A = this chain, B = another copy of it.
Amino acid sequence: QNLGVKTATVTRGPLTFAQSFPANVSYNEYQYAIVQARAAGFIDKVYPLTVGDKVQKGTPLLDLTIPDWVEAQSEYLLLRETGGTATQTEGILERLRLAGMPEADIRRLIATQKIQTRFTLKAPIDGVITAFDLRAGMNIAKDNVVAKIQGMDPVWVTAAIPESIAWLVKDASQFTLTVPARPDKTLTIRKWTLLPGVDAATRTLQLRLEVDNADEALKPGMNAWLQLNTASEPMLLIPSQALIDTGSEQRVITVDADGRFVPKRVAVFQASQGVTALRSGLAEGEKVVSSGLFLI
């Protein structure tokens, strides 16, 4: 019975299991910007682009010219020269605006009077070109999409989850993303969410994470690990060190108000993270010796 001993204590509570997981990265199918062709027309220009580039605000991409409107709008044009009640001209401007013509061009046909055709469609938001490439002069009708833009303000990782473990997960703090490529600063998480779709091969649920990406960083199909921390229904837990065995004999020490140490027989359950969880043997309150010293 030395004196250079530390006193611990049985605490009630649960254990924390960790695990690392295969994370493939993805482009949010939500931060996409599509440009669609409201009317069936023809193309010219195109600009110098490939399928995967950067944009500033969208700015100008490929310009069209269309036949179907000029015929119709012209009748309007002479209707403004010859006698035509206000209501007449509006009807026409209405059938043209409905047929698809941008507002900015109509008001600037009524003001310049000079018939309109070459339209430049300035792309939305910032972002990264996805799809595209279609160029030169092609025949377009009815809204067909000619391009997209992918966002990188939110980014997507998806881990494979075993179903029971997946069911336990109910909070963002247990996740912990790490990435080989960019150690540097860590990578805050904005959202987590499970896709009830139960993979039939691996008994794996899809668990999606959204990622706070400002300065870019992550591309398609990089490499990332996702350590998570599960738990367990609470057990009487003690420091592993304060515990000892060797054979079939396993147990430790009890400290008293009247400081005298009496060995007590206990039976362990699990022991992860450096803390054991006892099946039976001790009571919640009892104190215990951690990293101490005694003499037989």
Contacts and interface: CB of A to CB of B under 8 A. Distances in A.
B19 A164 contact: yes
A203 interface: yes
A47 interface: no
Contacts of A232: 164, 166-167
Interface in A137-192: 162-168
A281 to B, nearest CB: 12
A264 to B, nearest CB: 18
A50 interface: no
Contacts of A277: 167
A205 interface: yes
A164 B230 CA distance: 7
B17 A270 contact: no
Contacts of A168: 164, 233
Interface string A227-238: 000111101000
Contact of A164 (B165, B194, B205): B165
A16 B272 CA distance: 25
10 contacts: A19-B164, A162-B165, A163-B272, A164-B231, A164-B232, A166-B232, A167-B235, A167-B270, A168-B233, A196-B271
